[PDB]
Amino acid sequence: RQPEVRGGDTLNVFLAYVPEDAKAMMTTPFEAYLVNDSNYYLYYTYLSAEGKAWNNRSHGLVEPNTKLLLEEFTKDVLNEMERVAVQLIAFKDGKPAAIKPAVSVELRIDTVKFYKLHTFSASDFFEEPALIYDIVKDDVPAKQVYV
Amino acid sequence: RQPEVRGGDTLNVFLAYVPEDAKAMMTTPFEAYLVNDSNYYLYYTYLSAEGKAWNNRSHGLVEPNTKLLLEEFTKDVLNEMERVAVQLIAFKDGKPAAIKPAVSVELRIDTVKFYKLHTFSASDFFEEPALIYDIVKDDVPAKQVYV
Ligand SMILES: [Mg+2]
Numbered sequence A, B: 001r002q003p004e005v006r007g008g009d010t011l012n013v014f015l016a017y018v019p020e021d022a023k024a025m026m027t028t029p030f031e032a033y034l035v036n037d038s039n040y041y042l043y044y045t046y047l048s049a050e051g052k053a054w055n056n057r058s059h060g061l062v063e064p065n066t067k068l069l070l071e072e073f074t075k076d077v078l079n080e081m082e083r084v085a086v087q088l089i090a091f092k093d094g095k096p097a098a099i100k101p102a103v104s105v106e107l108r109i110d111t112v113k114f115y116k117l118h119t120f121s122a123s124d125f126f127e128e129p130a131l132i133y134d135i136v137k138d139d140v141p142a143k144q145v146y147v
C-alpha cells in the first residue's frame, strides 16, 4: 500500500476528459474521470443539466490519491454535457483531519475542444492530452469559474 | 417497496439523539441518527472536533425516506461532542432531480440536555423523545444556527 502524500492534505480535485485513443480523433470515444489529488476520501456525484432539472451520471466513493472513471462516451453525448456539475464531500477515516468545504461546482463544458486534440493539455495524470477542469484547487472550490 | 413522498423533493435532514431506554435515564446509552426526510439519497459524514482537527465518527449512504444509526454511545462520550458537524450531498439515481446544495453544518451540542429527558421533544421519527438538530430544513442548510 501507498502512504499519504506530502502536501496532499490540501484538497485538489479535477474533472478530466481524455480520449480513449488520442491517435484516432475521428473515431475515438472519450473518458470522464474524477481525479483526486489528495489524501482524502471523497463521496461525489457527477450530474448533467437538462432543462430545469439534472440527471445523475455517476456517484460514489473515490479513495485518496487516485482517479475514478465516471463515464465512457461518444461525441453524440456532448449534446447532453452543455452544463455539468460535480458535488462532493471529503473526509479521512480513522485519522484526524481538517474539515473541508462541502463542494458544488457547475461547469459549462468546452465541447468544441473534443474535435481538436491540440486544445487538450499535457498533464501528470495521463499519457494522452486531457481536458481538465478544476473542482477544488488548493482547497478552493472552483465556483463560477467555468460558467 | 415504498414510493417517493409528496413534498419529499424538498430536502429535510436532521441529526437526532435518542435514549435507548427513555425509562432508565440513569443507565441508558444514547443513539445518534441521521434522519433523511426526503426523496433523495445522501452521502454524508458525521464528525467531531478535537482541537484544531476533526474525527470522523460515521460516513456513508442514506437512502430516501429513512434514518440511519450513526453511533451508540454512553454519556462519557459527551465530552467528545462539544462540537460536531454533518456534511452531505443529495442526489437521485435514475430520475431527473433539482440540484441541491452541498451542505456542511457545524453544531455545538447541548450536552446538558442528555441528563434531562423533559428537554427532549416529541417527534414523528421516534416513540421516545428526541433531541433534534436541523441539518437541512426546507432546502436551507442550517449554517451558524447551533453555534
Ligand atoms: Mg502526461
Ligand SMILES: [Mg+2]
Binding pocket: B122, B123, B124, B125, B126, B127, B128
Ligand atoms: Mg413520537
